[PDB]
Amino acid sequence: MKTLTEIKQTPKGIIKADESFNQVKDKIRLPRRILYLGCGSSHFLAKLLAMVTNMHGGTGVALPCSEFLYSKEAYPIGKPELVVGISRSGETTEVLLALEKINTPKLGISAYESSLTRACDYSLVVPTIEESVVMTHSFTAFYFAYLQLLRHSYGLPLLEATEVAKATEKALEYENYIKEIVEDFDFQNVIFLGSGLLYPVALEASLKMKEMAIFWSEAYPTFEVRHGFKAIADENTLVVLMAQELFEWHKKLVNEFKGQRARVLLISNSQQEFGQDYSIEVPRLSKDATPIPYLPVVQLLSYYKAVARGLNPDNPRFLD
Amino acid sequence: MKTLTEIKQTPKGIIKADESFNQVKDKIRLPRRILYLGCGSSHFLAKLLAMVTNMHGGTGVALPCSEFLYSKEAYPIGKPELVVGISRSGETTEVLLALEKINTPKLGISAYESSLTRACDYSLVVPTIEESVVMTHSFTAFYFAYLQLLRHSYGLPLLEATEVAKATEKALEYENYIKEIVEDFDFQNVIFLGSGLLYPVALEASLKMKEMAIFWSEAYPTFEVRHGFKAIADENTLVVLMAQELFEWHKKLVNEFKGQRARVLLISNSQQEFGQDYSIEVPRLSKDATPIPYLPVVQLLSYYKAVARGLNPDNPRFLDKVVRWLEHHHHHH
Structure with missing residues (x-):
């Protein structure tokens, strides 16, 4: 089963994440004020990325894409210097749509060169391949790559x-x-x-x-x-x-x-x-x-x- | 059942809320940068208050009090001009603990004069009485009372x-x-x-x-x-x-x-x-x-x-009417 195999690919995913980081580290300099947008797992990943941004002395804010679309007035967005869009496929409609509304520099995080990466100023593609409907090692991989990138951008030592x-x-x-x-x-x-x-x-x-x-x-x-x-x-x-x-x-x-x-x-x-x-x-x-x-x-x-x-976790009821 | 009765008291809570507001409106001006701290229902209330602060053109941030105690560096706190602590009893230990670590002006929102109100610079006391372990109309009353205070502080028409x-x-x-x-x-x-x-x-x-x-x-x-x-x-x-x-x-x-x-x-x-x-x-x-x-x-x-x-919502299994911790780890004397 794909889901289990993919969970077990986690250590190799970290290595891939470091490679992806290294490829982009001089192309992308993360600023202090960053807004993070994602859906589902990628929203929880956006929250995580917002937290580390705060932990390193920046200002990180995350919200679900549809809350940004319909209720942004309610949230402490401020004036971000970068907006980060996250989608494993890079084809999540809501992420594309939220970013279209934004004239700020944009960074796209995905597992694929995709609509998302092709719609941003910058892209961080972490090629952890998942065939399961459920995101597993990609969450972890994206997180690590972004961690290094943040650390590099803020002049901190690398992990x-x-x-x-x-x-x-x-x-x-x-x-x-x-x-x-x-x-x-x-x-x-x-x-x-x-x-x-x-x-x-x-x-x-x-x-x-x-x-x-x-x-x-x-x-x-x-x-x-x-x-x-x-x-x-x-x-x-x-x-x-x-x-x-x-x-x-x-x-x-x-x-x-x-x-x-x-x-x-x-x-x-x-x-x-x-x-x-x-x-x-x-x-x-x-x-x-x-x-x-x-x-x-x-x-x-x-x-x-x-x-x-x-149950079969590779393809759950009702899920795309 | 006290919980039904208290829910039904929601209209009367709005009036009381309006009166608590009127008691403090000339004593407290809310600024633009406000942190909101609560637990349980009062945390969700804190999120609401943070949202209306953003809507009215300020910067509102809310987090659970324990996250402020142990993980504050993870949150976009910044440099608030006011911290608001919320506790229906006024005796929720985590609210007091978090506020004690804060040097900025403090506003306590409670249903009672309490440890919380004593520990703050200013207090919005809304006397909705609830006997249920479950908070109902007090949530709505505290909310309306603060909404008035924000509009008043921000030179907006009152509701x-x-x-x-x-x-x-x-x-x-x-x-x-x-x-x-x-x-x-x-x-x-x-x-x-x-x-x-x-x-x-x-x-x-x-x-x-x-x-x-x-x-x-x-x-x-x-x-x-x-x-x-x-x-x-x-x-x-x-x-x-x-x-x-x-x-x-x-x-x-x-x-x-x-x-x-x-x-x-x-x-x-x-x-x-x-x-x-x-x-x-x-x-x-x-x-x-x-x-x-x-x-x-x-x-x-x-x-x-x-x-x-x-089931009995006045006294659910396991739940504590006030959520507490030992406040001082050593009794100094």
């Missing part, structure tokens, strides 16, 4: 792509364990939790669940979940807590979910024993690269839950 | 509280029809849709479903749902599409959901035949005040779905 790729290899090693979780626990809904850069990862993981498994999935900033959303967590809920650094509040939060009889998978960059039901540790990376190894974990989890439900 | 309140009187007259939807369709999940100011209303509605009904509910910017999310809508799904203005893309979207066998409830300020299964027309208002009548409606829908499932 070591071999090191990042290796982190995703170590994450993919948890495949058999992830299978086991899906076998051990017949969960009926799932809550993904993350803060900062792990929040868009939570949003994307929850989308993988919807698309691949037609499943009840939710995503929240880590501690925000206590404020009413936790009501839907019980003995049939898996809570996937993702954190780069852990502190006493995460211990309490795991225990609060366990008190409602939910089971907790803790995914972290650091060993921490909070009594969680399941644990996956991924290698520590720089602050900005940190989310990268979490992606193939949640992609594998989503894939195996869809297969358990007798 | 007419009386007209806004009558708008919600009309919305509430849909109570019977709302039960009928619930009686009619045993839906197993719900998707709320809205664009701009109606998108936070969609998030809030979907939170009311979680809290009151312990139910599978989702919320999206209207046309964003098309990108993969629509996969979970089938014959067991109610799609609640809310829109001020209605156009051709709205028609195609309705039909796309119909083709998946879902049923559609259309809440709008007009009466158009788009193929929907259910229809609710709410009074038209100024563009910023437009979301106000939609709130009672989705609160009623959540309430009636809860009651049909035999």
Whole structure:
């Protein structure tokens, strides 16, 4: 199955991403104020890219293309120096249409030379090929290429792509364990939790669940979940807590979910024993690269839950 | 049930909101750059307040208080001229914690004089009383109260509280029809849709479903749902599409959901035949005040779905009336 093969191509995708970055690094100088536009997974990727832009001392704003089209007055757009359009195919109509409205320099991110790249001042084509309807390793690949480009543009040191790729290899090693979780626990809904850069990862993981498994999935900033959303967590809920650094509040939060009889998978960059039901540790990376190894974990989890439900994640109902 | 009663108090909340505004209008001038901080319902309210700040030509940013505590560098915060903390009780620990780290002027929005109001430079206290763990009419009252303060600060005409309140009187007259939807369709999940100011209303509605009904509910910017999310809508799904203005893309979207066998409830300020299964027309208002009548409606829908499932929305399982943490990690003495 394509989806699984493509998830497992993640380490090679990082290497391709570094190559794509290198090809464009002197052609494209990312400015400080950047607007990011995408749909579906590419919107959650836009959010991630906006976050790292802020983290490096710029101003990053993301919104869905249709909100830019119909409700831009409601959003803190300001005066971006660059607008980034994102589409895996490069043929997403809404992205093309949003960018047509814009006279600002534009950059297109895609897996293909496409309408999108051909409509922009600049293009970052990351040739991670996916035949699945569901975006997997391309999300991660686009993210890494853009990370390097941002770092290069802001005069920061580059990351070591071999090191990042290796982190995703170590994450993919948890495949058999992830299978086991899906076998051990017949969960009926799932809550993904993350803060900062792990929040868009939570949003994307929850989308993988919807698309691949037609499943009840939710995503929240880590501690925000206590404020009413936790009501839907019980003995049939898996809570996937993702954190780069852990502190006493995460211990309490795991225990609060366990008190409602939910089971907790803790995914972290650091060993921490909070009594969680399941644990996956991924290698520590720089602050900005940190989310990268979490992606193939949640992609594998989503894939195996869809297969358990007798579904084909390569071509989901209703989806183009 | 206190929650029904409190939802029905929405008109009276608008008047009280107008009076809280009048009490502070000459003491507080809102600037152009404002950060909004809240949690749960008050976070979704913060998103609404940020949006109207942008609409009125300022810069409004909103994030959950815990994201400000632990991940603020990820957000386009900038250099706000005012930070607004929101908490119905005024005792939500994360609001106090976030505000303590801020040196800029601070405004507290609460239903009570409280830790929050004491910790801020200025306070917008709106005395809507709610006994339910679930926030309802206080959301709408705080919203209207702040909307006045923004227009006043920005030298704009004030809204007419009386007209806004009558708008919600009309919305509430849909109570019977709302039960009928619930009686009619045993839906197993719900998707709320809205664009701009109606998108936070969609998030809030979907939170009311979680809290009151312990139910599978989702919320999206209207046309964003098309990108993969629509996969979970089938014959067991109610799609609640809310829109001020209605156009051709709205028609195609309705039909796309119909083709998946879902049923559609259309809440709008007009009466158009788009193929929907259910229809609710709410009074038209100024563009910023437009979301106000939609709130009672989705609160009623959540309430009636809860009651049909035999649940108690005044005191949902697990939920805490005030969401708290130990505030000071060492008691200094």
